Symmetry: D2
Subunit: 333 residues, 4 copies
Amino acid sequence: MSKVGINGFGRIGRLVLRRLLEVKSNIDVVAINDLTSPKILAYLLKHDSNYGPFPWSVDFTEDSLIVDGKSIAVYAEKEAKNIPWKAKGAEIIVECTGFYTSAEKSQAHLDAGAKKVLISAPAGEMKTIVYNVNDDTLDGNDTIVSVASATTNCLAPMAKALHDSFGIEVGTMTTIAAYTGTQSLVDGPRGKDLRASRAAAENIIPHTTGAAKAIGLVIPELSGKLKGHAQRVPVKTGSVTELVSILGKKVTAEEVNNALKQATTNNESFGYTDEEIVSSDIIGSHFGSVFDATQTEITAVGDLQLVKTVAWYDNEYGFVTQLIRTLEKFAKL
Amino acid sequence: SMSKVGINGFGRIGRLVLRRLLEVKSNIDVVAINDLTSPKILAYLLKHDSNYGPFPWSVDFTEDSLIVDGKSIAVYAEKEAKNIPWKAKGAEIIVECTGFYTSAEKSQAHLDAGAKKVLISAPAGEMKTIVYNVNDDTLDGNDTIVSVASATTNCLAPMAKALHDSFGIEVGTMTTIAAYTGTQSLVDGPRGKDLRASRAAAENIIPHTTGAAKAIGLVIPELSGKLKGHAQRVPVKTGSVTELVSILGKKVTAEEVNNALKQATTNNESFGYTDEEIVSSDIIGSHFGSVFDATQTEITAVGDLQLVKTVAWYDNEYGFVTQLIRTLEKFAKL
Amino acid sequence: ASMSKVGINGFGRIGRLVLRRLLEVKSNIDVVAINDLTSPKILAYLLKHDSNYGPFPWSVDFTEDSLIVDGKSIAVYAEKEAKNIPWKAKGAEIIVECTGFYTSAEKSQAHLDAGAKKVLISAPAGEMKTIVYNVNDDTLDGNDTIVSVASATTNCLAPMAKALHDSFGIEVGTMTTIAAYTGTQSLVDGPRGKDLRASRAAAENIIPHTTGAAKAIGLVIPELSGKLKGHAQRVPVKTGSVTELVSILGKKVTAEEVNNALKQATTNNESFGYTDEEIVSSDIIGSHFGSVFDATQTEITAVGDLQLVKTVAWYDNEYGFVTQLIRTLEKFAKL
Amino acid sequence: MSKVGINGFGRIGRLVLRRLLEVKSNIDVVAINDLTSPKILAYLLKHDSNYGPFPWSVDFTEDSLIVDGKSIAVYAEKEAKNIPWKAKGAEIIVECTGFYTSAEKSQAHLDAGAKKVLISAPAGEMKTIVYNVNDDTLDGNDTIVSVASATTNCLAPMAKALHDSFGIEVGTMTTIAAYTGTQSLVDGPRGKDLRASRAAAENIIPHTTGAAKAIGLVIPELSGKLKGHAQRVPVKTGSVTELVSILGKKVTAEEVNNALKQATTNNESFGYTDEEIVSSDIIGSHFGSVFDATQTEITAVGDLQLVKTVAWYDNEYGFVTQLIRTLEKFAKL
Ligand SMILES: NC(=O)c1ccc[n+]([C@@H]2O[C@H](COP(=O)([O-])OP(=O)(O)OC[C@H]3O[C@@H](n4cnc5c(N)ncnc54)[C@H](O)[C@@H]3O)[C@@H](O)[C@H]2O)c1
Ligand SMILES: NC(=O)c1ccc[n+]([C@@H]2O[C@H](COP(=O)([O-])OP(=O)(O)OC[C@H]3O[C@@H](n4cnc5c(N)ncnc54)[C@H](O)[C@@H]3O)[C@@H](O)[C@H]2O)c1
Ligand SMILES: NC(=O)c1ccc[n+]([C@@H]2O[C@H](COP(=O)([O-])OP(=O)(O)OC[C@H]3O[C@@H](n4cnc5c(N)ncnc54)[C@H](O)[C@@H]3O)[C@@H](O)[C@H]2O)c1
Ligand SMILES: NC(=O)c1ccc[n+]([C@@H]2O[C@H](COP(=O)([O-])OP(=O)(O)OC[C@H]3O[C@@H](n4cnc5c(N)ncnc54)[C@H](O)[C@@H]3O)[C@@H](O)[C@H]2O)c1
Ligand SMILES: O=C[C@H](O)COP(=O)(O)O
Ligand SMILES: O=C[C@H](O)COP(=O)(O)O
Ligand SMILES: O=C[C@H](O)COP(=O)(O)O
């Protein structure tokens, strides 16, 4: 399979295309579905507030984009069942709208002529992949799969290394995270969630996330062993995840950092840093997660020990590099 | 006089309408609110405000009402104004703050729904349009639907009126450096047809069209067609500033311009004056529509050819709301 | 009425708010002198116009050597060395030390050498009496001359830790505060002392930041000495901050039980508030508490007999902390 | 002359070095003077909040940086007259501290053994160069020259084009500009300038600038014909300049836009756009100024006409590209 439709050409949907070109995937996006015109999609693709100008030529006609000299159809169907995927023969849908995050909802893509769906968010109790953690669980019979959230892709590799080296008995996560499209520009209704209604660039806003709660889908041994949440803050992209764990062994900071370093060695998904970086330094990361040995903290009172480990993530472009790794393998099975 | 008000669109402007009415102990009673959400969520937004802080009065709710300072306010959720049941609590004057009924044709739906008069919190085409303390004497008993134009009009008009009256404005162009609002985007993505409006508002200087100068003739007839302008939307949450560059009808000094302005702001509850070195956060919470800033006045001249730059601040939320309320109170007593 | 005469050293974010709060509560303390590094004109400007709290609620004027605030004169000095401040000229006895440059008993001694009698330091100042009001203020006595009120973070952390310790025991814990940026940080990337991360553009980054709030908690709650660690993530909000604590407690608990204990500890407690509303950081701006526990963020994670308890409290690290500083000051002045 | 020293390794000073490497200049930076350690300078060079990771290797020693393999001496002399520029033979000093903005002040570098100084700011009535407006005025005997401000580099090529095509009779400028290190993070004393004392990322802050007032140093025919100021706003970099003029001829918008387009043709310093860009789209620009045809406004009543023209500028990297063009020419005289 090498024909891709993008449903939802948003922050994630546009960067998917950017990253496919940057890595020279043999995948071809043949169709984009969204809610707008080729003119406006072209403008958005050409000019990006977080990553700067598109590195390839971009033009449009009434019905397509022309990206690096190649044509991509543009549709504007708000219900997925009506999307004409058959027209250009889109095989794998990268479902990036947020409105089809369940196998039953995303079935609509298959009913409409697609063969597979890769959902760019948590999508309940379905197969959910963090690349370089559990991508060996994918087979040729999977049709609709999830790559969870950016926060999952941050948390999972760090949890996996800790669990493998020391065991995690129980833990809780807080991610201090860049604001996203699901939040509000000015104070006003945003569905049912009271905190999501508040001005995002003017507030620290507590925010629910299932990344720890559903980690069992990616690291079966940790099912039910973690909880967590987010604090959304006023940065445009670039985020950090802290995990406080009770481990299966007594450890030093140095031991923990070394075990992590080893986990990140020749691991294109998971990086390491012992530099004094800040969030803007992760913008444009090609990792899903970058463990930061400078923030490791072991609090020990006799037999009791709390371990705080911290990893950075570009919740836009970093997460996208993982989505694309999963896509490229999904495409071959 | 009319005393019962309905608010359509309990948004940034709608909520501050209620706050200001209670603040000035108005005899006007808000008896109903129409929006698209639950009392619960409206109560949460009313209690907790990112720009102005905690609501200064008690807030509770029921399944179909808010209870504000102990007084019950009906809450409806009709997306079409014609369907709002304004007669249930006898709402007489609707303060129309949704942005979706900005014409006479559109807003007369509230009259079909049982109201008596409508005051629109935005420009609404060529209808009677009032900047209080500029042209509020043009209101009369036969006006049924009226506009108070934009925050930018309320900032620009008193400054332009004073310049027009003292010196003449032959021609001018405005630029307002303005706080971002709800019509903009949190992250880069579609926002109707306007390409700039699609960009992340708190991360960019964004050029932005406004009719404030173009439609100024509704408020100052002598300046009809004599002004143009635009906005640069920037990352501040509220508090904005408007610059006007004019060819005036007289050779002037900065001191003469500033004195003329100071005079126009004397005994004027709508239009303030400052010669302090203020910045935008100092205007948040202002009870004026516009505050002229003498420290920014600039006269550029080569021979007879003279450009005059005058600058006024405005709290595009609360300050504008104070103008809306002054107009509302007068409108209720005609 | 005790009419102690106060001097403020460092008329900065905290120093200016100290005056605001004293006037707001109609304190019997008289502020008679201020020392900074600048002119009365500039201090008058900054006092009148505040980016976080708006217009000063009283009149402000200046002369060549004073501020006039609501009609009352306050002498202005500009002595970069505290020993040279003429605190005796207007009789300033209690100095509120808000510069960041005298954060020890030995450094703040200079105010006593200059003729003051007591110093209250608006920051951690090592192993000296360190007070969080309504946690350990009953340790002050008539013999104290130099005392600390620790950091805003300590004032947020301590009341929540004290309630938890008193109700359930805390065996061990780690804190992270997601916190507004302050004057120690940088506007644009550039050198800022030795702290590399402090060099980075504060309104454009999430910046990890060290704080002693957890590590030194034993000054305030002696039973918890050595049992807590923690750090901050500084973020682009101008004021208003939140502190999370993850604890192993001495007994198994439910979220309700933790929230009820905290509720009880906040009852009739002018220093420590409670909320169960879904507030965000701007809702804490101008708080008159040092800390507001947020029951909505309580989380119990348990596997077998292993339990992690996460408890969360807001704080306005400027005005909120200042209200604690003032309560301490008022008591410290009556002894 | 090919050996350079940088005084002030700040936003401008570090980007000077970045741009010299980027263009593979033959200029050799042999020394840097600042107030801090090599360790801290290395960290700042490597990690940049506006422009991301340094594209070359960076290490340090107790008295040096090692950048792309090459040693650069680091001094910490707060008085320029004490900088030991003769040790590594620095001939031309790029003066980027802001503390030596006059001939009399920057003479110190020549006393310290340098031969020439290029000041990264306005510096009074001395030779002042906006590259591709008046760089022809640089002379073999000049030893101290200025490149004015970022705002001047934005305004001048627009003013030159208008003046050449139509005449500017009189004009006034407002730049809506990114905040800079002369401002304050929190409200507090900032020398004598009261507006500069205010929290820069939380305010619109009027700010005086000489860009227009001193335009006659760059375009002598416009001496005394312009005034202007800035409004500093909460964006980290990327700015815009509006100019309102009385021109010597009646014009259409198309005519103004066409004249500006011609002036930008084969002009490495002056770009054009008719795209609906916003400030983030200018970040990383290699122009001193980019005229934006989309904002052109002609306001006419009878025989009176006001003409508003608008150009974008990256007040950091864009201006630095102009500084380096000027330095390259200067070094060969
Ligand atoms: N932004 C992040 O940090 C991030 C990271 C990882 C995963 N995700 C996930 O990826 C998905 C997309 O997030 P995003 O931040 O790009 O959101 P976004 O809001 O930027 O983009 C959504 C896009 O989908 C379009 N859209 C909405 N409804 C549609 C419909 N019915 N049909 C077609 N197009 C539709 C919108 O026009 C928009 O272009 C979400 O499920 C989100 O949870 C986001
Ligand atoms: N924010 C400002 O600076 C400002 C200043 C002056 C005037 N205005 C004008 O006031 C109006 C409101 O602006 P705002 O900033 O308060 O916008 P907002 O988006 O904050 O509020 C709009 C409110 O109306 C509600 N709504 C939308 N469609 C509706 C419908 N069909 N029926 C009932 N309720 C509906 C929304 O739920 C929201 O609560 C606009 O016309 C705007 O131009 C805004
Ligand atoms: N969030 C907060 O801002 C906060 C909260 C609690 C405690 N504190 C503490 O309070 C103190 C002040 O913090 P701030 O935020 O008000 O800092 P600030 O930088 O806003 O204020 C410092 C003031 O001290 C003056 N100053 C510096 N050196 C001086 C000297 N040698 N003599 C006289 N004046 C001098 C400065 O000019 C400035 O006005 C620090 O110790 C800080 O840790 C700050
Ligand atoms: N940032 C901009 O947008 C911009 C654009 C054009 C020109 N400039 C100008 O360039 C100059 C530098 O601006 P910047 O934004 O890089 O400022 P900055 O504050 O970022 O850098 C100044 C550097 O000089 C150092 N320094 C200060 N005093 C010193 C001394 N006495 N000796 C040696 N080093 C010293 C500082 O430690 C810092 O590294 C100024 O003249 C400024 O007007 C700035
Ligand atoms: O509420 C759902 C998400 O947690 C919000 O943002 P996101 O979907 O872009 O990650
Ligand atoms: O709690 C935080 C401190 O009081 C922060 O202080 P600071 O102003 O010294 O950064
Ligand atoms: O424009 C006047 C000041 O010099 C401020 O900023 P800048 O010097 O970095 O341009």
